[PDB]
Amino acid sequence: HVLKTKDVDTVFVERQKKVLSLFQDVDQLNTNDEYYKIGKDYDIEANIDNYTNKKAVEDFLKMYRCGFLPKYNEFSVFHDKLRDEAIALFHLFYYAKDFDTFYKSAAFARVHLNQGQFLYAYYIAIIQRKDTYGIVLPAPYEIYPELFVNIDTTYKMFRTKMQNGLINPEAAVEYGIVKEDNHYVYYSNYSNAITYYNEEQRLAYFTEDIGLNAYYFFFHIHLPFWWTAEKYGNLKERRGEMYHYFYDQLLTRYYFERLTNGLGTIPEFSWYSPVKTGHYPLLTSYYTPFSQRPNFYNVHSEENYEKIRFLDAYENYFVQALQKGVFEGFGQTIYLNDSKANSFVGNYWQDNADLYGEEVTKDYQRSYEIVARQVLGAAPKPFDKYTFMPSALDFYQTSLRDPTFYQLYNRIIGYFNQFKQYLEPHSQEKLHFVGVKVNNVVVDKLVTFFEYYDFDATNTVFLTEEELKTKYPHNLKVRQPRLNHQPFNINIDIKADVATDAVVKIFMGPKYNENGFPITLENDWMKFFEMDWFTHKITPGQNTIVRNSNEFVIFKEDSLPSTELYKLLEKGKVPFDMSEDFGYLPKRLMLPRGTKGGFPFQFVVFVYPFESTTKNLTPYEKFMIDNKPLGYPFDRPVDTSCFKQPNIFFRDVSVYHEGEYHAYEYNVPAYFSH
Amino acid sequence: HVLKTKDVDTVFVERQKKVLSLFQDVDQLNTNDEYYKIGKDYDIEANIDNYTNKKAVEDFLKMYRCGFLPKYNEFSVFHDKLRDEAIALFHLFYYAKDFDTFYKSAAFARVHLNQGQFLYAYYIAIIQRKDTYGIVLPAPYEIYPELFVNIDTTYKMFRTKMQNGLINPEAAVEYGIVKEDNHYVYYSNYSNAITYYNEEQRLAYFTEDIGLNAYYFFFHIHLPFWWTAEKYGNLKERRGEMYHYFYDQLLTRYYFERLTNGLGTIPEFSWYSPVKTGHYPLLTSYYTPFSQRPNFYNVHSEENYEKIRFLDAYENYFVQALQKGVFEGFGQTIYLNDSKANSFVGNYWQDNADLYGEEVTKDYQRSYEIVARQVLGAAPKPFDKYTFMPSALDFYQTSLRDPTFYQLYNRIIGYFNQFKQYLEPHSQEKLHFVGVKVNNVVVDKLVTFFEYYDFDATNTVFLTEEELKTKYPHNLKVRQPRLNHQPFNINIDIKADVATDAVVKIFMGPKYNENGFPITLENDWMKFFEMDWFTHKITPGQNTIVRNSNEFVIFKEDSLPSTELYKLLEKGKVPFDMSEDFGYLPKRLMLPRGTKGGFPFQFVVFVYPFESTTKNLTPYEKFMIDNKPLGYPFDRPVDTSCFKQPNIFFRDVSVYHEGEYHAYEYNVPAYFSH
Numbered sequence A, B: 001h002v003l004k005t006k007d008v009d010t011v012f013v014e015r016q017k018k019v020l021s022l023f024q025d026v027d028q029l030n031t032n033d034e035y036y037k038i039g040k041d042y043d044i045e046a047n048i049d050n051y052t053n054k055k056a057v058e059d060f061l062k063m064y065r066c067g068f069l070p071k072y073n074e075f076s077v078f079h080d081k082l083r084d085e086a087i088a089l090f091h092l093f094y095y096a097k098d099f100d101t102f103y104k105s106a107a108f109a110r111v112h113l114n115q116g117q118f119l120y121a122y123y124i125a126i127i128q129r130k131d132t133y134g135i136v137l138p139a140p141y142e143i144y145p146e147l148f149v150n151i152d153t154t155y156k157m158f159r160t161k162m163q164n165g166l167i168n169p170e171a172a173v174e175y176g177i178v179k180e181d182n183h184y185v186y187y188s189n190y191s192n193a194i195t196y197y198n199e200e201q202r203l204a205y206f207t208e209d210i211g212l213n214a215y216y217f218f219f220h221i222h223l224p225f226w227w228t229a230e231k232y233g234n235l236k237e238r239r240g241e242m243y244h245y246f247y248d249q250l251l252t253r254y255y256f257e258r259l260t261n262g263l264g265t266i267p268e269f270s271w272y273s274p275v276k277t278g279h280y281p282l283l284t285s286y287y288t289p290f291s292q293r294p295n296f297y298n299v300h301s302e303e304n305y306e307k308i309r310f311l312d313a314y315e316n317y318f319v320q321a322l323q324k325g326v327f328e329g330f331g332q333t334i335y336l337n338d339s340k341a342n343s344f345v346g347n348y349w350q351d352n353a354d355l356y357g358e359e360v361t362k363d364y365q366r367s368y369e370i371v372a373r374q375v376l377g378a379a380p381k382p383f384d385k386y387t388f389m390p391s392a393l394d395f396y397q398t399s400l401r402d403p404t405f406y407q408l409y410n411r412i413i414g415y416f417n418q419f420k421q422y423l424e425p426h427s428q429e430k431l432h433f434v435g436v437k438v439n440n441v442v443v444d445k446l447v448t449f450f451e452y453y454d455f456d457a458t459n460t461v462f463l464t465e466e467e468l469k470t471k472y473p474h475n476l477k478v479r480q481p482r483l484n485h486q487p488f489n490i491n492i493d494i495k496a497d498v499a500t501d502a503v504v505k506i507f508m509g510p511k512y513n514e515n516g517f518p519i520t521l522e523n524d525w526m527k528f529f530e531m532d533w534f535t536h537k538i539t540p541g542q543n544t545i546v547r548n549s550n551e552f553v554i555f556k557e558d559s560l561p562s563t564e565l566y567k568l569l570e571k572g573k574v575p576f577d578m579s580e581d582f583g584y585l586p587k588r589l590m591l592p593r594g595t596k597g598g599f600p601f602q603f604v605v606f607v608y609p610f611e612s613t614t615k616n617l618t619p620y621e622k623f624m625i626d627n628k629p630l631g632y633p634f635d636r637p638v639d640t641s642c643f644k645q646p647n648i649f650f651r652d653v654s655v656y657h658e659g660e661y662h663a664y665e666y667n668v669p670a671y672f673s674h
């Protein structure tokens, strides 16, 4: 298994090394590094001519002269002041006329501003600026290790750095601390191996997977809710569509993990009753432990009355719009069948900039999601604008760790899916592919297993004045057994009459509902996980297609550590996926953990005529190369019919799991010491 | 597989035919039957000299002159008036000087009294009277089909009888109605195939198994809570022990079923909060449907205020007694270490006759169990002393159907197990068998599966005047897939120093807790299901014991329908087990349904010195042939020690399940019509 690579020129390489020079030892400043001198004395005012937008720069300066979030404090985009500052900073980065002015602005920020705040605006700018297109971003877990690993292993790294090494390596092994080469390796367990407060803990290997969490972070920085989608041209008109697709797909995938663990559907809650599923983040900031929400949390308390009424009102509005058939307000009146209605509900639920026709949201345009994250996070109200007790719900990099995150968005998609039943359902004729028929589909054995995975966590530690004189160590390694599966083929048999360009899609869906009974397309159309999308020229007669799971376009390879990125740069290359598909879900997670006896699911292949791609979303996500609605044909209900189309095939499938069932078993000292 | 038989003489054979003559078409009277003429004119008063207790007879006559529960009304021993009348009836039967007087009294009852009331006292008298010892009892599901099969199938039988056969056999098949020979067979689903109101429904194949339920009914009539245990001699002093053992074992067996179904530990509840798991009995009486308790039932309502205070007080008394190290009241002072302590707590929790040192319980001796069943049953207060809306908790034959049954007794055994930690824990020395060592234990593959089981359900129907002139039809058969498992051997390897008489016990226990983590003997000693108990002579050197599951003494063969009993009688024979082990749990249920991949458990063999059997309980249950406390050595905690005793062995074991996972699949017309 070789990783696909891509060729880059000398300019790109030079810009790549520059951006990476600002992603090192992020919680500390190195006066020996070139960036410190540049950044410390950069005069934004004096170079105001090197920015395409003078107003944005002046607003930044005006804001900056008043002070920004101090260093070391936690930064969260869900807090007004912090967000506005971060956004002003983003504008300073985005409007730099050229890479050089941008780099200097970045260095300025790195030296003067809050590390978290800088990293946030930095990450987004690299994604948004045209001149940095293709630039490979370092893994978020490598940049925010304190957000991707529990305190028990963070504390072990702290103890190692404080002791300046291992004092008794033979004893350290019993605490998962091993030395390999010149690296210190830390075997890190998911939380279900240290605390089991509720049954949802059984899903910890999935909800705490660094790749899954990185995936949500990438989703957000690819296109922040506070920013307009203008830059992406077409996506703007299809933004709400993308919202639905992303969350439906994520919720459905999470649902599958629940199913193979016997946890049933995503729980429903009320803002007027205790929230059943609590959550205890084993994370910490530099000033406080993350807030905890005990099981059966009394959410309807005096501190949340007003917020709950707002959330209620927000839901009420939508439900009433569905009833009367029209969305009023926001400067327009949309009937449910309007051609922009789909984008409206999506933008409405997310309360994004595009809902208002602006480039950035304002503080007074209150958000359902932000307020809901606030009350579900269970944190006491902020001490002040710059100080708050964070919860898993305050970061896109830790959101998926909280069971209520899925419950919140499942509630939202719940309404979105209700809205979809008011639309014209897909007719049997529009779904039919005259001349095309799928005679059979055979799927190879589906097997999951846990496999060790390492990543650089050195950013967890603080370097010595002497250590800063020499090259960075990239000394610490965090090792966790992560979910994965064996590659598998899908053999498709297609009997055709005429020759035509066809599109073939591969989905994965449940076979039974939570109670073990047969699924129903009428109520379960939204439970199909899109796995593949590709064009294929169908020749008259017999057509045999073989798609290997490693080829599914929906997923990407694991990221490589910054150190391997450099070696690859010497060759004038960059990982293909890491550069162009950084937002895709890691392929090692395309399958939910199976069971020893094999858990029931079904694959489905659908092939339809290839045609218009005039309003595709390639500038956003590469695989979106058609005009059909995202998730087609499971994007909305379908005109109930008891006789399936010949161009769609459903194949039963079983997901088995090999090796140790529980991930923590691979971190038992007796085991890894062999 | 041949069923063990037993030889019986002419006297026995004649009495067996007499007792069975009163178990036919029980809801109807046959004036053509000999018993009718006998019973209709039998004069109890005139024969008073034929009973060994004249007071008992006069009390029955005095009571009977005021009236008894009318025919067709539902009978339940949990209602005062009904119980008192039944007990008087039981005394009339128990004190008959000889079988003939007994028979005539019974015939009198069958003609004049409420069917259910009669069957109840009849069943018990047959078990208690010395001259009827060994008499075979008909299966309870054959006598009370309307309490062992849901109404959907009962209504089908009614339809068949009203039509006097099938009007369209070909159509009837699609509804589970089939004709085989001269029988009408009805495929009957467990409730989870028709309504899935909560996750507990997943357990319906077990909680509704007719054998499991019959088992509870037999436990009761064997020795009612309202009767003293005097007749059984030693049982009286060890009654409490027997109470703990019966329920703990049953709760543990049920816990195993939850485990392989991902349902965790037995839920805990509060009398002051909504009861989470509801229950919908798909049963009916002749006047009303059974009462239903919806999920999240508001149990703390004005109707239950006083009852709940009584229940709370009952529990407080016990908790405080434990805290102060002594039980006070009920005519004595018992410190926790008193030899009479164990029986006191069991008799206290059951509020039985022996708690008071009386023959039978009185109306004012309020029962925790009866009141708890009253409020958990959720039925509205009784219309009057003879009329009430029944719940599954009003019958020993339907109790195991209701999830709260296990929650109630789990709560009670929880208190019993807390009491046991105040006693002297078995020391390692007493557990040690000097010179005996179990080197190894090997268990054959553990495999479960569903298999069709039939029983006579003709009592569900009413016969015609003409049909009554001829022999009873035994026309209707109920067919259901019931749990079962393949036979398996356990090879025990023992290394002895000298020769001795040893006792060997076999238990099945969980391997992991509900969260999937290792079990702990300090906290899970009460979770070991006793499977076998037998004496074996040990010779010096190497010993090898091979026990087949069909040999385990704790279980019994399934019961035979009454028609088969007659045929066997012609040869002067009766089924061995049905005769003297009717109270045992059906062996086809000794193993919980497994999983396709195999669910983890562990078998443990323990061998100790065979000695004293002075206070054994053979008169009650055959297998209780020792002096040791029931469930030894897991009858109480053990002096925690990380080093295993040589004479005890634990072996990991996996229970797989073959064929269809869901029982209802075997009742699908397309399936059984082949």
Ligand SMILES: *[C@@H]1O[C@H](CO)[C@@H](O[C@@H]2O[C@H](CO)[C@@H](O[C@@H]3O[C@H](CO[C@H]4O[C@H](CO[C@H]5O[C@H](CO)[C@@H](O)[C@H](O)[C@@H]5O[C@H]5O[C@H](CO)[C@@H](O)[C@H](O)[C@@H]5O)[C@@H](O)[C@H](O[C@H]5O[C@H](CO)[C@@H](O)[C@H](O)[C@@H]5O[C@H]5O[C@H](CO)[C@@H](O)[C@H](O)[C@@H]5O)[C@@H]4O)[C@@H](O)[C@H](O[C@H]4O[C@H](CO)[C@@H](O)[C@H](O)[C@@H]4O[C@H]4O[C@H](CO)[C@@H](O)[C@H](O)[C@@H]4O[C@H]4O[C@H](CO)[C@@H](O)[C@H](O[C@H]5O[C@H](CO)[C@@H](O)[C@H](O)[C@H]5O)[C@@H]4O)[C@@H]3O)[C@H](O)[C@H]2NC(C)=O)[C@H](O)[C@H]1NC(C)=O
Pocket: A040, A065, A066, A067, A068, A069, A070, A071, A072, A111, A112, A113, A114, A386
């Ligand atoms: C415990 O607990 C407690 C309780 O809580 C606490 O306390 C707290 O504390 C805190 C802290 O400390 C505080 O705060 C702080 O304060 C301070 C002071 O204040 C004041 O003052 C100021 C100043 O003044 C001045 O200036 C101005 C302008 O701007 C003017 O106007 C005036 O006049 C003056 O003048 C002067 O100036 C100068 C001096 O400085 C010179 O030039 C001369 O001298 C002249 O003359 C000011 O500004 C203020 O103001 C305010 O206030 C007032 C009243 O009072 C008013 O009127 C105003 O308006 C204002 O106010 C307000 O407004 C509003 C309201 O309505 C709001 O917003 C608020 O409130 C405000 O405030 C006063 O007066 C100060 O300074 C500081 O600041 C800082 O921080 C912040 C945040 O926090 C920011 O924003 C800013 O920007 C700053 O920053 C900085 O720092 C930090 C730390 O802290 C950091 O992180 C950052 O980064 C930065 O850094 C920088 O700086 C520093 C110093 O400062 C240095 O050091 C550094 O350096 C480094 O680094 C670099 C890089 O970057 C390198 O290169 C090097 O090398 C190294 O070295 C840098 O440079 C703050 O704010 C408070 O207050 C308290 N609270 C209370 C209640 O009290 C404590 O802390 C604790 N403790 C423990 C231990 O934990």
Ligand SMILES: *[C@@H]1O[C@H](CO)[C@@H](O[C@@H]2O[C@H](CO)[C@@H](O[C@@H]3O[C@H](CO[C@H]4O[C@H](CO[C@H]5O[C@H](CO)[C@@H](O)[C@H](O)[C@@H]5O[C@H]5O[C@H](CO)[C@@H](O)[C@H](O)[C@@H]5O)[C@@H](O)[C@H](O[C@H]5O[C@H](CO)[C@@H](O)[C@H](O)[C@@H]5O[C@H]5O[C@H](CO)[C@@H](O)[C@H](O)[C@@H]5O)[C@@H]4O)[C@@H](O)[C@H](O[C@H]4O[C@H](CO)[C@@H](O)[C@H](O)[C@@H]4O[C@H]4O[C@H](CO)[C@@H](O)[C@H](O)[C@@H]4O[C@H]4O[C@H](CO)[C@@H](O)[C@H](O[C@H]5O[C@H](CO)[C@@H](O)[C@H](O)[C@H]5O)[C@@H]4O)[C@@H]3O)[C@H](O)[C@H]2NC(C)=O)[C@H](O)[C@H]1NC(C)=O
Pocket: B029, B040, B065, B066, B067, B068, B069, B070, B071, B072, B111, B112, B113, B386
């Ligand atoms: C709708 O809804 C409504 C509402 O809920 C309902 O109503 C109800 O109904 C019911 C039912 O019907 C009712 O009840 C009833 O009533 C009746 C009447 O009463 C009256 O009367 C009586 C009687 O008297 C007499 O006797 C005595 C003695 O014992 C004396 O003393 C007197 O004087 C008299 O004498 C006379 O008469 C006689 C006749 O009888 C003769 O001998 C001569 O003539 C002389 O002179 C009485 O007892 C009563 O009393 C009472 O009351 C009073 C008041 O008024 C008082 O004072 C008293 O004390 C008494 O008691 C009381 O007490 C207490 C109080 O505190 C309480 O506990 C209560 O209250 C009581 O009451 C009167 O006066 C009656 O009779 C009836 O009875 C019956 O039943 C029961 C149960 O229920 C029982 O227990 C009994 O025993 C009886 O039984 C019977 O019947 C049944 C049915 O019913 C059955 O099941 C059984 O088994 C039995 O049977 C028998 O008999 C019959 C008749 O009756 C016949 O028929 C039969 O036949 C058969 O048999 C065999 C088989 O087994 C064969 O063999 C043959 O063939 C066949 O036929 C048998 O025999 C009851 O009780 C009520 O009341 C009502 N309620 C109201 C509010 O009103 C309705 O019903 C509905 N409907 C629908 C449709 O659903």
Ligand SMILES: *[C@@H]1O[C@H](CO)[C@@H](O[C@@H]2O[C@H](CO)[C@@H](O)[C@H](O)[C@H]2NC(C)=O)[C@H](O)[C@H]1NC(C)=O
Pocket: A331, A356, A357, A358, A359
């Ligand atoms: C009054 O409200 C209107 C609309 O609600 C505001 O107009 C918007 O202004 C923003 C500039 O911040 C534009 O980006 C939008 O396109 C405008 N939308 C509409 C519908 O006009 C207007 O700014 C408000 N009045 C004032 C004085 O600000």
Ligand SMILES: *[C@@H]1O[C@H](CO)[C@@H](O[C@@H]2O[C@H](CO)[C@@H](O)[C@H](O)[C@H]2NC(C)=O)[C@H](O)[C@H]1NC(C)=O
Pocket: B330, B331, B332, B357
């Ligand atoms: C008052 O109550 C006491 C206690 O319940 C009764 O005493 C019992 O009497 C019976 C005689 O039938 C004895 O067998 C018991 O051993 C006694 N128990 C105790 C604790 O003493 C007493 O009989 C009752 N008195 C009356 C007049 O009914």
